[PDB]
Amino acid sequence: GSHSMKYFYTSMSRPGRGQPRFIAVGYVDDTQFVRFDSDAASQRMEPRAPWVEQEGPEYWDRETRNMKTETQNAPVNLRTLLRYYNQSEAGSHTLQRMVGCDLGPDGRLLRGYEQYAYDGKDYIALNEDLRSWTAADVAAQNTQRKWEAADVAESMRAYLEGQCVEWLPRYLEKGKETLQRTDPPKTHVTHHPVSDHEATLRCWALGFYPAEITLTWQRDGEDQTQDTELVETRPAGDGTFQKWAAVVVPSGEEQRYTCHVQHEGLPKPHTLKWEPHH
């Protein structure tokens, strides 16, 4: 189908705790493959997925030099942002970056990303055209006009349409046996009384990959998205994911409800209902 490669950098200044801290994590869809921490012992990009380790030392030194470079700039951008927003030193701040690309089933670039965020809020972002930018607020403009003056978008665009698109497939190739596979959710419904008048039906979905999934509670074939409680999809810790939808129901009317699970590993969606009797 269509995949995506994404990197997530986090730069944090920590006044009186030492120089800023830089952390980087990378993912191929819902799988992290590399990691870096300017605090860790190493000081090198590290593999966090088996299928990566088979790259050559040449590959890792390159990445590590990069992460070291990022570590270096960190305290600079953080200082700049401090200037741009007219803030003092005392405070503790965060500069976030997210660069990546999405490829369609064919393998052509569906769209790349290059965006930052200061202290949680949007800072600047390469527009979908990969040529113009968008500045969150007045300060952010500083970076905008500065990047335009320097055709920064150009280089980013060259990466997104080049390196990013060319690499994402090599990772998918080597990762074949796991990245390019879909494990359907193992589902089942449970009944939990809440009173003499209402029971909680809970629709389970576990051990599935990728993370995208849809659970819907239907009553007589009617979507019950309002009375449905959805827990935010979470990590099983072994690669697969979990999730469950719950809806409260009047005792007896159990059979009135049906659960719908949709995943890309299920040609035909799963549809289940609670079972107690006999």
Binding site: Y7, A24, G26, M45, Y59, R62, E63, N66, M67, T69, E70, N73, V76, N77, T80, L81, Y84, L95, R97, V99, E114, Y116, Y123, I124, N142, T143, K146, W147, A150, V152, S155, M156, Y159, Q163, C164, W167
Partner: peptide, 8 residues
């Protein structure tokens, strides 16, 4: 592979 970083 990681891209190159520009400075704000």
């Amino acid at each position: 592979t990681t891209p190159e970083s520009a400075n704000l």
